[PDB]
Design an enzyme around this catalytic site. Structure first.
Site, PDB file in Angstrom:
ATOM      1  N   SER A 180       0.792  -1.064  -0.032  1.00  0.00           N
ATOM      2  CA  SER A 180       0.038   0.105   0.010  1.00  0.00           C
ATOM      3  C   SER A 180       0.955   1.251   0.008  1.00  0.00           C
ATOM      4  O   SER A 180       1.754   1.317   0.666  1.00  0.00           O
ATOM      5  CB  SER A 180      -1.040  -0.166   1.377  1.00  0.00           C
ATOM      6  N   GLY A 181       0.698   2.230  -1.023  1.00  0.00           N
ATOM      7  CA  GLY A 181       1.304   3.218  -0.816  1.00  0.00           C
ATOM      8  C   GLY A 181       2.509   2.969  -1.906  1.00  0.00           C
ATOM      9  O   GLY A 181       3.329   4.257  -2.195  1.00  0.00           O
ATOM     10  N   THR A 185      -1.533   2.067  -8.327  1.00  0.00           N
ATOM     11  CA  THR A 185      -2.749   2.823  -9.045  1.00  0.00           C
ATOM     12  C   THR A 185      -2.205   3.836  -9.886  1.00  0.00           C
ATOM     13  O   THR A 185      -2.478   3.887 -11.039  1.00  0.00           O
ATOM     14  CB  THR A 185      -3.772   3.308  -7.893  1.00  0.00           C
ATOM     15  N   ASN A 228      -1.621   5.593   2.990  1.00  0.00           N
ATOM     16  CA  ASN A 228      -1.759   6.123   1.553  1.00  0.00           C
ATOM     17  C   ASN A 228      -3.045   7.032   1.868  1.00  0.00           C
ATOM     18  O   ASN A 228      -3.938   6.597   2.106  1.00  0.00           O
ATOM     19  CB  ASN A 228      -1.714   5.097   0.628  1.00  0.00           C
ATOM     20  N   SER A 231      -5.729   5.522  -0.650  1.00  0.00           N
ATOM     21  CA  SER A 231      -5.558   3.971  -0.760  1.00  0.00           C
ATOM     22  C   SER A 231      -6.663   3.253  -1.493  1.00  0.00           C
ATOM     23  O   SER A 231      -8.100   3.646  -1.351  1.00  0.00           O
ATOM     24  CB  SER A 231      -5.362   3.491   0.509  1.00  0.00           C
ATOM     25  N   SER A 232      -6.340   2.300  -2.398  1.00  0.00           N
ATOM     26  CA  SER A 232      -7.411   1.480  -3.099  1.00  0.00           C
ATOM     27  C   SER A 232      -7.781   0.314  -2.015  1.00  0.00           C
ATOM     28  O   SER A 232      -6.923  -0.191  -1.805  1.00  0.00           O
ATOM     29  CB  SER A 232      -6.661   0.591  -4.246  1.00  0.00           C
ATOM     30  N   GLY A 452       0.408  -6.981  -3.015  1.00  0.00           N
ATOM     31  CA  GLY A 452       1.201  -8.370  -3.096  1.00  0.00           C
ATOM     32  C   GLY A 452       1.004  -8.831  -1.951  1.00  0.00           C
ATOM     33  O   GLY A 452      -0.178  -8.670  -1.337  1.00  0.00           O
ATOM     34  N   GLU A 454       0.172  -9.785   2.029  1.00  0.00           N
ATOM     35  CA  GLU A 454       0.119  -8.942   3.065  1.00  0.00           C
ATOM     36  C   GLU A 454       0.345  -9.411   4.385  1.00  0.00           C
ATOM     37  O   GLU A 454       0.053 -10.380   4.774  1.00  0.00           O
ATOM     38  CB  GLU A 454      -1.432  -8.460   3.103  1.00  0.00           C
TER      39      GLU A 454
END
Ligand SMILES: [Mg+2]
Length: 742
Positions: A180-181, A185, A228, A231-232, A452, A454
């Site tokens: 994340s981050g 995206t 993030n 974040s998605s 990827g 977690e």
């Protein structure tokens, strides 16, 4: 000609700066270095030590401080000669130990060169600042250029994929994963930007609609997290559709794992989905009034995290952006209204305060929130009311209304909200697809933007899900790398554990984790304890990749590709069934809202199939893999430089850990074992000619010349292999060569 114009921004932002001369001599040096750990405890922290002496089997070197230390040649992490500092592909390195890989990446990142290939992968490290390398003029430079002809860039792999598609008449895929981050995206949007430019028309409606779909989904699917600001909270596979001619002809989106829980709860400093804030910020004084809106602080679902705004972001302006996207894709104002009304009702539902202690069953004294919500949803409040606290429940042939307590009542309400939310998201996706998607498409290039592996402090069902997908993806890569390497060796005329983890998760007979979860899911009275005991019963000291903890009674470990992951079992049973009271479905099924009715009457949105959330997950992942298997894939590994969201702070531990998990270091490990360096004959001579008292820099007989040098230097032939067009070198050889005298 930017590529040749050493003064271009192309040169400035994408290349290692080139000076006057290229001459081998410039880099001559007497010094030999090694990468070592000053603190053996901190194994990803290295420093460079100059080797002072050696013995037949060890080297002796000088640390940072002047402390002599010694090491085993066979354990030494030799440092590549300076010429290798900054290469565009890690595969060009002679010594491929970990520290060496990190160093090359760091050297580049210190020049703001955030993209580097590693063999088949494109490694992309978030710089945490905006590098102007995605302008149209930048798009233009990549057009039709081979990987090897231009600098590393997301645009570059996107062009390679597009040409492969046109050339091989084969669908393609770009897998963009990482933490994340990391910038997944962001890069995914660069891929779409690029394709619409290189293949779009009238440069167009379709293209603007395709581009406009993201903004829509981000508002309903992305949120501020501690890692993030945007974040998605869902994963996605975007299929970009083309005609026989190579022109964009459509698109489709598949979404996965939306975090519906965020709707009802957010951790400290985090936010709920963007859209909630957009609406409140941006609704018109007249819209507010009709939707019964107030500030965020007045909403239970928005006033708990302490944060309702994002540094440098205008919720009002974004709202504008979101409604605009909607207009462009084609959502009618009516449709738009109901969307917002759903967002609104959700907020109202969260404001419902259940009270008890009359009996032991809940009640509603103030009915304002309820009315508010019913109004906007277009449902009967009295029905809503009963459905919340007095749902009728099947106990025998006996269909009877049960009076729930405040808690159960509250949880039910939360279930309702989550359903509306996820169903709305699903409907928005379908709506989008309808407009964009081609029934008749010739080819496609699909982009997967998902996390990827977690591994958090706490791992739960969703984590197993995503890691399950990642085992599949890592195994796909590994199969791919394996085919490609062989082909290569073949074209040049040169001479598992995955499965076991996968089976433990998804196996049917004997049953794996998900199968046992599905089984327990049928028993209404099963609990966290029955479930975890069942798991331990089948795998503790019985399945090599599973581990029952020494003390915790609620967790279990799985050895994944990325390492062991510990999972906690709480609520899995619930997560697996994702229940909603029937009376609640009944209530809303009657909605007078044209959108809401759809969320509850369309079986394609209202229901999973009766199949469990694990079974659906397993099913969607297999379809996805089936599709990927039909493509020629391309892998981008996005990396965060640290856990603080800061530029100029590339943390070795942080990075290395990602390289370990995402398959980049494994790949090199495997690569290092054979003939990692494969160079075009002429390329070799052009640089090393002057090492043999024979060779002409220029020389038609490049392979012969190569052999000249090699011979001249007396190189050990087991160290190299003559291929049809490149000379193949074992690890280290090329470094020794670089180190030879002119
Ligand atoms: Mg994202």
């Amino acid at each position: 000609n930017p590529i040749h114009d050493r003064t271009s921004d192309y040169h400035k932002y994408l290349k290692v700066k080139q000076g006057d001369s290229d001459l081998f001599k410039l880099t001559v040096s007497d010094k030999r270095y090694i990468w070592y750990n000053p603190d053996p405890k901190e194994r990803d922290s290295y420093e460079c030590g100059e080797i002072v002496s050696e013995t037949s089997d060890s080297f002796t070197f000088k640390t940072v401080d002047g402390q002599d230390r010694q090491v085993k040649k066979d354990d030494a992490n030799q440092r590549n000669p300076i010429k290798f500092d900054g290469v565009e592909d890690m595969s060009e390195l002679s010594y491929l130990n970990e520290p060496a890989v990190f160093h090359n990446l760091r050297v580049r990142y210190n020049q703001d060169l955030i993209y580097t290939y590693s063999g088949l992968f494109l490694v992309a490290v978030n710089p945490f600042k905006r590098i102007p390398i995605y302008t149209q003029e930048m798009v233009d430079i990549f057009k039709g250029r081979r990987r090897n002809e231009v600098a590393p860039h997301i645009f570059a792999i996107s062009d390679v994929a597009y040409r492969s598609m046109l050339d091989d008449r084969q669908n393609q895929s770009l897998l963009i994963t990482g933490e994340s981050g990391a910038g997944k995206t962001e890069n995914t949007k660069k891929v779409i930007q690029y394709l619409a430019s290189v293949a779009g028309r009238n440069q167009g409606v379709l293209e603007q609609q395709i581009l406009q779909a993201n903004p829509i989904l981000e508002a309903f699917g992305n949120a501020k997290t501690t890692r993030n600001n945007n974040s998605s909270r869902f994963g996605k596979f975007i299929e970009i559709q083309f005609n026989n001619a190579g022109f964009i002809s459509g698109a489709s989106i598949q979404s996965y794992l939306l975090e519906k829980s965020r709707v009802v709860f957010q951790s400290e400093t985090e936010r709920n989905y963007h859209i909630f804030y957009q609406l409140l910020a941006g609704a018109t004084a007249e819209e507010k009034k009709a939707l019964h809106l107030a500030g965020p602080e007045s909403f239970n679902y928005l006033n708990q995290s302490g944060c309702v705004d994002i540094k440098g972001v205008s919720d009002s302006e974004e709202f504008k952006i979101t409604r605009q996207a909607m207009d462009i894709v084609g959502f009618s104002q009516e449709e738009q209204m109901s969307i917002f009304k759903i967002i609104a009702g959700i907020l109202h539902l969260g404001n419902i305060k259940f009270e008890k202690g009359a009996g032991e069953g809940a009640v509603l004294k103030d009915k304002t929130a309820l009315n508010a919500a019913s109004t906007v949803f277009g449902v009967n409040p009295s029905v809503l009311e009963k459905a919340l606290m007095e749902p009728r429940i099947l106990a025998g042939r006996d269909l009877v209304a049960q009076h729930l307590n405040v808690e159960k009542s509250s949880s039910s309400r939360d279930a309702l909200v989550k359903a509306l939310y996820g169903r709305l998201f699903l409907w928005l996706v379908k709506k989008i697809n309808n407009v964009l998607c081609q029934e008749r498409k010739a080819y496609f290039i699909g982009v997967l933007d998902i996390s990827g592996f977690e591994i958090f402090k706490v791992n739960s069902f969703e984590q197993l899900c995503i890691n399950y997908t990642n085992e599949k993806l890592q195994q796909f890569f590994n199969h791919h790398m394996f085919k490609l390497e062989q082909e290569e060796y073949l074209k040049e005329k040169i001479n598992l554990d995955s499965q076991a983890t996968i089976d433990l998760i998804d196996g049917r007979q004997p049953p794996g984790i998900l199968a046992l979860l599905d089984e327990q899911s049928v028993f209404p009275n099963a609990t966290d304890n029955t479930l975890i005991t069942k798991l331990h019963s089948h795998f503790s000291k019985k399945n090599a990749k599973y581990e029952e903890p020494r003390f915790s009674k609620t967790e279990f470990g799985v050895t994944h590709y990325a390492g062991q992951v510990m999972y906690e079992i709480q609520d899995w049973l619930e997560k697996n069934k994702d229940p909603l009271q029937q009376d609640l479905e009944l209530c809303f099924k009657d909605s007078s809202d044209n959108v809401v009715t759809k969320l509850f009457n369309d079986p394609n949105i209202a229901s999973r199939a009766f199949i469990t959330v694990a079974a659906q997950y397993k099913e969607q992942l297999a379809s996805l893999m089936a599709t990927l298997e039909t493509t020629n894939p391309h892998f981008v590994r996005c990396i965060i430089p640290n856990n603080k969201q800061l530029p100029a702070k590339l943390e070795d531990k942080v990075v290395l850990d990602q390289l370990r998990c995402n398959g980049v270091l494994e790949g090199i490990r495997i690569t290092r074992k054979g003939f990692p360096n494969r160079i075009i004959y002429a390329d070799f001579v052009k640089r090393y000619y002057l090492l043999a008292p024979n060779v002409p820099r220029d020389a038609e007989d490049s392979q012969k010349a190569t052999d000249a040098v090699l011979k001249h230097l007396n190189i050990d032939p087991e160290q190299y292999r003559f291929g049809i067009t490149k000379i193949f070198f074992r690890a280290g050889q090329l470094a020794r060569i670089e180190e030879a005298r002119e």
